[model samples]
Target chain A: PSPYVEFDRRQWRALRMSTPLALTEEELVGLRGLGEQIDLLEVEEVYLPLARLIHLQVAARQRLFAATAEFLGEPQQNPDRPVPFIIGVAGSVAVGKSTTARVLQALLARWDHHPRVDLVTTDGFLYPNAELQRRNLMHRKGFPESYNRRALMRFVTSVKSGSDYACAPVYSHLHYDIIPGAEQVVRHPDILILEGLNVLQTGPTLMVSDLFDFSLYVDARIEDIEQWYVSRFLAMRTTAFADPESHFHHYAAFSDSQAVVAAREIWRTINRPNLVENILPTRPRATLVLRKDADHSINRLRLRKL
Target chain B: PSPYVEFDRRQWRALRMSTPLALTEEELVGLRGLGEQIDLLEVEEVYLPLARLIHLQVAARQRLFAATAEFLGEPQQNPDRPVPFIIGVAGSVAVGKSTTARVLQALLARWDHHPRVDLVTTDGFLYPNAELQRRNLMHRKGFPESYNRRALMRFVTSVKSGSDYACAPVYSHLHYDIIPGAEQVVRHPDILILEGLNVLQTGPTLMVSDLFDFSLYVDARIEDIEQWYVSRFLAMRTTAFADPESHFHHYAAFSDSQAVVAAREIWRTINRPNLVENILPTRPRATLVLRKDADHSINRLRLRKL
Candidate 1:
């Protein structure tokens, strides 16, 4: 059997919560409730050592590259070249992959030597809602075939090729679409955080996971996530949905009973099926897995370092 | 240790005589026959089981497809859809991958259920000789970067998608170029043989081998291959090279010493390096390995099915 470690939410909360030197309280707030369910203390003790091991691997890869270059008669070494630590975060919808990515970005940046970090969401690479509507696949939104794989490949290739600045399209949650003509220029950074529903999914043709140097899957029981999703939807109806700019503002006028029915219908018709067919199948491909408890907190972690 | 059996040239010939299938005398004469060192008996007793295994796999895959389709709510089964059996054959130059693919095609076609077997070589996908010379990579002809991987991927995708017709550009050995406008249209075939040097090679970028359902590697001692290459070059000079359409017509007039020097130079500078860097690295990826002894007779077979 594979080795694994488990920690309850209270134990996770007892772990030291350190933030990057530059992060503000508002940014930290986004990661606050996570500790109620996850044992951050165990994460620091266990995952930090794993991260250090990865650092060693990066060093070895650099040495191998240098040696190969020397054999090919190129002796020059660029000291400013930063090894991009690509980390992919994948999970089912409403499973807190976004929160985990944000928290990791903050914690990993606290490392003294690797202060510079960037985050890119695969959501930006998704085809626009209009395109999905045109294809009559709007209902099948997170499916693998819905992604613009060619563009995603090109973006990752550019980053891996050591470009000084790589640009990716920006997505707007408020508009529920890719922001046309808007781009995020990712400057060369020591680390990059990639969060998505299917970042760890294997390529259909290659059967190999590409682009991702490391990956994490946030996992929880389907029943728990469904409960959390419905509750979150109710909470958002009273708060964020009141904003005029919000795409989900239309739902604000619905009664609790009406909203609950809509939420359950959406879950049953779209999200649940996609989760079973596509998302869950990719769990084994993850480098690390964060298993969450019923209360929406991570209770255990499975890392595939070896 | 793995078990293997060996047979010499006379024993091989005797075994061939016992087979029910008739071999044309002229075609049989074309096969390499080094009287004292050759072995052919292993072809029947060893390869027969392997061929049947592949046939069984094809049958199983068809059943799996039918089951999957039914589970996915397809109303009617499509019997007209041919089950694809993609076999990748890879080996160093002069190791007889071409002959292996040809023999497999013939044997598989003789099966009662599937009569349509097609063979496609990755050689046609290689950039033309002129393009290689223009790019100043003529010496690195078999390198991973030398092939048009995207086109190869598209071709395989088309075939896998069950297209009515898929076409590949034709390459000419005598002219050493991609024949302009010449194409091979592949209809739905039960079995497709893809033979190449680097067909099993993997890299950061997508590779052609990722499309293969099964792969085979033809293996022999490097020294034996070197000797075989030299002998083949010498034989071709006296026979094939003397023909009007032979690309190496000029080599037919060369002195024996000069011919030997040319063959050794080509081997040292091009073929040997390619075999080591590009072809040999893919050995572990092969599903089955045919190990040839001196005088070009298979002495052992290693299958990764376990």
Candidate 2:
């Protein structure tokens, strides 16, 4: 038997088990930009149970550390040192992984035990456009090899090893490259949420996901994923691409049908293949998988058994 | 806080929670060729709770598979396919990790839910003597890089992926090398216990231990570990070394003091460094830890919080 239990929407919601709805509608409003509709009911049912699980895990780890200190007969030393609980959120682009991570972060922070949460996206670890061009990997962008895997490992290792602060290079979506002088500094928050296309991927000596205490894989059928990707690209054609500095500014002037054709072309050539070859294979490795349906609502959840 | 919770012997024994003792004394005998003493009481107190925990985990996974099949509307397909639950046992040399794995395997197999249990030692995955010599790694044989990392990964991956049969090369302690034709075959088991000096170590892409559903680290002070290593070496001098094919046959003729000196020398040069550099660091990564006292009895247990 596989190491996962499947639950339909009703059963999954029942697993929430009295976890209160700590999220308000205001916190849920700003999370949508590309037709990724997530309401408070969805947050209470789907994400509340996850928040409760993570909350329970954090408390258990805290007790374990206290027990360790007591076992060593060193209660005088600091038993409550900060060891960040990391959660890796992984899925294909446009699968709503980002919104899932954001909602989780907001909900988890509201819990009294550990309020300080930081969210880090893997886009910051991608190699600069010049480097990708030099390596002839621009067309293969977002593939596993396009990022500085070593740098990503080092950043996560430092955080997991209890460094006081860690930082990651920031990527500019408007400029379509890494910002030279800017960095996203992580100050050892109580919880660190990592959202990315390949955060769960394994590396040579150490997988970045090995550092995660819990992980979630946002899953959908390939047809739905491609459709969502194209739909989001069309949505971005007017909103984001209208900005003069946007890398995709040319799409703003295209006709509606022309924009749809470009969106389908991009999805067909790049995003679809990347999703098939690299991202989908890692779904089984996650601790929990949220399977989304056509209308951007989760209908099923699979949790790996302990 | 770290991911572990420590428990004293008394506290750990209480966690057994009315689990009946299922092991017999005869099954516990014949596992003590290296002065590793384990009593039936120890099995009931220390290993019984572990067996119960793993049994519970196996049953939960079984339920999960059934749920998945039902959710997918494919209950007719064989949902009860074999998915081996792998446990990794790691520690310094002469720390009684072997005995621990053997006891767990014996106890786990007795549970009526899953009777087929398999035990595999990572020693079989080490390169042959010729290969080690050719690579100039004889002195570093127990180190992580000394083993065929790819081969070991392949073997464990196949078993975890539910392969019908997987085979590992055999290593003979008398010859102190991998046997040419012999292999240890694993027919998809309900549980597999992997015991070795470095079974918990991580690799490039997938860590061998990542395949483990649970893992254990046998821990002791450096002084105690060295003392145990030397004591075991002295005992082996007259027994195993008496055979002509034994790797340390020359030590059989040495006086008691001379044999002690040789044992300490080997420990200081090779075993101690490998323990310090490679094995000890992986202790924090284990799901549970057993701390052994000078008399080879487990006095404390540390379990990682879920």
Candidate 3:
């Protein structure tokens, strides 16, 4: 009897069928078989509404910005001008920021007002692994200092400045380095999603969190996340990591038992400690918290304003 | 008792007169009035030697870089190339970083072997006061976020990448804003001095500080610094602030008593707290500690080795 009862996948599908918020078949296709154990119906009921809510907020912010500009005696502000509505998605490595970012980007793009949404991850700001080793800080890779923060700030600044064209560096997971000249352009995007573990950390006087128009944190019990991370690593060994192009191709060579042990060790040594020390502490700062059940379905949602 | 004795004006003049270091007579005239103050004498005995040491270190590093390149199977490493020696000077406001930077730039330039030295202040990186007021962070002006960090980083990166011509934005104290399009072109120099309050505080996970070949921290007792700052502010009110072009011309209207009280209040509320929380904490991270005596002369210098 907690008042917060989660809608099951069936209930979600029934509700979607009856309401205007029904996800299209394509949207459903996007959510289908997200994982072997996860259910797409739960996402429809929970995450779909959350995404819609964010869309409304984005619209509201545009209105607010217009009003403010008018009040400041700049009423002739161009309506066609792009104002980047930056949304930061922060969480631990396996807490599912990528999945959340991908799902939300798709959902947000469906909104007519912000059709050209762009998603940029902070991964591109990381120095190549070789540079990290040269600097003798390979062990401290994800800390605030490990990022090319100035470059990250510049990317955000360019987007916010409403440039006709702006580019962000691309990062390769296989090579684990910033591709020197590769760039993704933002051409008048109404919404810009910046997903990273530490995107919310601010500059010298301001926290990075202060720059975001909105932020989402993916939350789960530590034990659940740890287990999920380990399981995901094991699953990747057979699926993604087995690919010759995978940076983690060596993981495929490990036996099932070896992979399991290695996964747990990495979880304990690197991911878990980072989650507790840096990632988890910042959860309270998020605008919305997406709490997942042990089985990885959405269980509860915590909205900051509420 | 500590083997470091304070020098008076006569002692400073005698030392300057005897030293083989080349200083322009015009610059010497400017130093005459402030000679009794501590900074000059300390610069003579302490910083002069340190600059020579850095000059030697730069030469060694260039050789090491060549050797490393050779070891990596690149025998074509150029031996005649002049490596840019970057020195970062960081401290709280009124710790005299401007004075230190100017003095060091002068001293390093006077060195026969490395006469081409450039000094770049981080002041150019600060956002205009208009931007600060809009952000509602006008009161926290000197904090890290107040500066355009991305631009600063790009400037440094360009310099390190051996760009033939690199420019940094110039700030006008009179307007208290960056002069748009105005730039200082930095051709290749033997040394580059980067002076700022928080330049040493790099991102948590990155080896950004590795870019600096050396870093110096100007240290003094908090109370002494506050006293010196207040005195300087009062002097500026009568001198520089009286100039119409001075950004602080408004301060010229303040009575002597009003200026002193205002200066102390600003120090206690904003500057002091920021120093304690942000700047002072970074003291140990510096490679060199220039401990100033009560009179503002650096009484001792502690150098750290690799």
Q: Which is superior by lDDT, 2 or 3?
A: 2
Tens digit of per-residue lDDT, candidate 3, span A142-177:
776778787787677666656667777788876657
User: What is the number of residue pairs that collide in model 2?
Assistant: 3
Q: For candidate 2, give fnat to 2 decimals.
A: 0.05
The weakest ten consecutive residues by lDDT in model 2 chain B span B70-79
Evaluate all candidate structures by whole-model CA lDDT and list the values in order: 0.66, 0.78, 0.69
User: In order of the candidates, what TM-score does chain B achieve?
Assistant: 0.84, 0.93, 0.83
The best candidate in terms of TM-score: 2
Q: What is the TM-score of chain A alone in each candidate?
A: 0.80, 0.92, 0.86
lDDT of 1 by residue, B1-306 (tens): 111122333432333222255444543443334232333444454444456556655654455444433322332222334445688999998888887887677667767666888999888888877888888877677776677776887786567656667888888776656888899989878778888887787743335554566789999889989988888889888788888787678988878888989999899999999888778877756767778877666766654311
Best model per DockQ: 2
Clashing pairs in 2: A203-B204, A204-B204, A205-B204
Better of 1 and 2 by TM-score: 2
Worst 10 residues of 1 chain B by lDDT: B1-10
Worst 10 residues of 2 chain A by lDDT: A70-79
Ranking by TM-score: 2, 3, 1
True contacts kept of 3: 0.00
Report the candidate with higher DockQ, 2 versus 3. 2
